[PDB]
Amino acid sequence: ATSSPNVQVYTYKLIKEGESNVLLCHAKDFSPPNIKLELLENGRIIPNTTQSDLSFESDWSFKLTRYVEFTPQSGYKYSCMVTHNGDSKEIQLDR
């Protein structure tokens, strides 16, 4: 009996290559609370990211965000690897 996370990967503002920005991976509606979020560039873990506090909603689902400052550059693919309930899913930036 589990609720899989609804995940969004996005930037703080529209990507302009060479301009600093923020990459975020946001997960919500999940339970149990055990979860891992990893920011990837071309499949490699991005270092020195920040994890938010874990939010506890009234329906007993949770929310969590991982993010980092970065500077988008051409050719790169940004995504988030999300592990919940022993299953892993990769989520693309998309836009």
- Experimental approach taken: X-ray
Alpha-carbon gap, residue 74 to 83, rounded angstroms: 28
Collapsing DSSP to helix, strand or coil, 25 comes out as strand
Q: Which of 5, 68, 8 minimizes the C-alpha distance to 36?
A: 5
β partners of residue 21: 70
Q: End-to-end alpha-carbon separation of the chain, Å? A: 33
Contacts of 78 (CB under 8 A, 6+ apart): 9, 23, 39, 40, 41, 70, 72, 92, 93
- 68: Cα separation from own chain's centroid: 10
- Tokens 């930036």 -> residue: 93
Contacts of 21 (CB under 8 A, 6+ apart): 11, 12, 13, 15, 69, 70, 71, 72
Domain total for the chain?
A: 1
At position 92, the amino acid (one-letter code) is Q
Q: List the domain range (segments joined by +) for residue 27.
A: 1-95
Give me the resolution in angstroms, 1 decimal.
2.3
Whether residue 50 contacts residue 68, with contact meaning beta carbons closer than 8 Å, is answered with yes
Alpha-carbon gap, residue 61 to 45, rounded angstroms: 27
Q: Indicate the Cα dihedral angle 28, 34, 40, 45, nearest 10°.
A: 160
Tell me the residue length of the chain: 95
